[PDB]
Design a protein around this ligand. Structure first.
Ligand SMILES: [Cl-]
Lengths: 72, 144, 144, 72
């Protein structure tokens, strides 16, 4: 894939650890989650696969917490 | 537009720090810094300030935060809130962490600040990174 | 405007690397990368390319540089110049170092590359930092 | 002074180690040297006094070299 592999691991970690738990998935909720993940990664790109996976989980969890998104 | 950058960086700092309340402060007039405004905030306002009267607060330059910032260091405290636009002591705030940001000509132009009402917060080393990344990007923006 | 950012970052990379010749390469069409253009350069052009014909060169994706970049790594070599717009081997070039840059949607969009005609250059660790800083900033810019 | 102290040490190092050696100082040569120093520092702000002094010398020297500026 033509994608930044560090962003991709970062994004996939956020998806599989957090976003997949969203109770009410929709177009709008996916657009807002990606906009946050992309802006955050573009602000400070991670450099290790291990750190990208770590930071994609943490960041998505914080987004879920601070945004009060229904999980389970 | 400058506050577009300010609000976008603040949203990231807020979420990554998991603060209860966050703000970007802007000094005026340029190079003189007699006044400080909140030009962007996230979370719940402290009870001692309102959505009105978030601008035009005087800057006390003898406060530790001002001098620590000009020494190129971040500032934290449990009870000194120099630029918060009120003289009321506001004990509901348990903790504050801030860093300076500098404009395109390297002049001290404001701060990025996070506050907690709860008494649990992540380490200062993580707060240092979150804040410095945003200051680096805010430091590259202009005023249309 | 994008090349305003490109040319400003390139000027910094050129001076800090002390390269003999430097360039920013841009892929087209977006997401497909069949062609690569030099949209900015510093220093003396190699003899095997001219100020005309700096655009529209085909991209060989089986070249090591392309695949190394998509593995998230910088690339260097003494003899493989994949995107240099000529098929001539150009032995006057002693060394090349490049890093990828990615557009606002994280798609491989081009490279930042430095070349030396002399055989002395600073370490790859210093070249890594110079290149990564510029890629980080170029990665935040758009196309008007 | 109201100035970024890391930039100031960085800039002063470049001035005292390199720019002061310029044979032909003028308005234009000072404007071009500052524009390079400021853009470079804004690109990657140094964080230690020691590194700022180091990097202001190196960067200004490279600027003098690559720009072929008459020294002595
Ligand atoms: Cl950066």
């Amino acid at each position: 894939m033509n994608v930044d592999p560090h962003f991709d691991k970062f994004m996939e970690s956020g998806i599989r650890h957090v976003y997949m738990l969203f109770e009410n998935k929709s177009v709008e909720s996916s657009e807002q989650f990606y906009s946050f993940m992309r802006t955050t990664y573009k602000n400070d790109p991670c450099s290790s696969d291990f750190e990208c996976i770590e930071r994609g989980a943490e960041m998505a969890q914080s987004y879920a917490r601070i945004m009060n998104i229904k999980l389970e | 537009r400058f506050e577009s950058v300010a609000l976008e960086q603040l949203q990231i700092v807020h979420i990554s720090s998991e603060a209860d309340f966050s703000a970007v402060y802007s000094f005026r007039p340029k190079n003189l810094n007699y006044f400080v405004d909140i030009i962007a905030y996230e979370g719940k306002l402290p009870s001692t300030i309102s959505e009105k009267s978030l601008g035009g607060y005087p800057v006390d330059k003898t406060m530790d935060e001002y001098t620590v910032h000009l020494n190129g260091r971040h500032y934290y405290s449990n009870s000194k809130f120099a630029f918060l636009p009120t003289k009321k002591p506001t004990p509901e705030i348990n903790y504050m962490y801030s860093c300076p940001y500098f404009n395109l000509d390297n002049i001290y132009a404001g701060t990025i600040t996070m506050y907690w009402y709860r008494n649990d917060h992540i380490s200062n080393d993580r707060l240092e990174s979150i804040c410095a990344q945003a200051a680096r990007i805010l430091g590259r923006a202009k005023k249309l």
